[PDB]
């Protein structure tokens, strides 16, 4: 039905929100500290000196274990 297409789109948008904002290929699993933006996979987070959301300096990267992983 049309509701199947609407639900497929909601699922797609939610799955895309879980993907790294830089590479768009791997699941987000890393937090920039101290700002707390959690938007990258470990490989892109290792290569950024500034947060790509707020531009604050990255003092270190915290790995995050989420239940949805």
When the beta carbons of 2 and 47 are compared against a second copy, the nearer one is: 2
Distance of CA 49 to the CA centre of its chain: 17
Interface with a second copy (CB under 8 A), residue from 22, 26, 38, 43 = 38
What's the length of the chain? 69
When the beta carbons of 53 and 61 are compared against Zn ion, the nearer one is: 53
SS3 60: strand
Rule CB under 8 A: is residue 43 a binding residue for a second copy? no
Rule CB under 8 A: is residue 23 a binding residue for a second copy? no
Least separation in angstroms between CB 3 and Zn ion: 32
Residue position matching structure tokens 């239940």 = 67
In 3D space, the residue among 30, 27, 2 whose CA is nearest the CA of residue 15 turns out to be 27
């Amino acid at each position: 039905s049309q509701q199947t297409r609407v639900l497929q789109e909601k699922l797609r948008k939610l799955k895309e929100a879980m993907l790294c904002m830089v590479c768009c290929e791997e699941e987000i699993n890393s937090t920039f500290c101290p700002c707390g933006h959690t938007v990258c996979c470990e490989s892109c987070a290792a290569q950024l000196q500034s947060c790509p959301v707020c531009r604050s300096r990255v003092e270190h990267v915290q790995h995050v274990y989420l239940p949805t992983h």
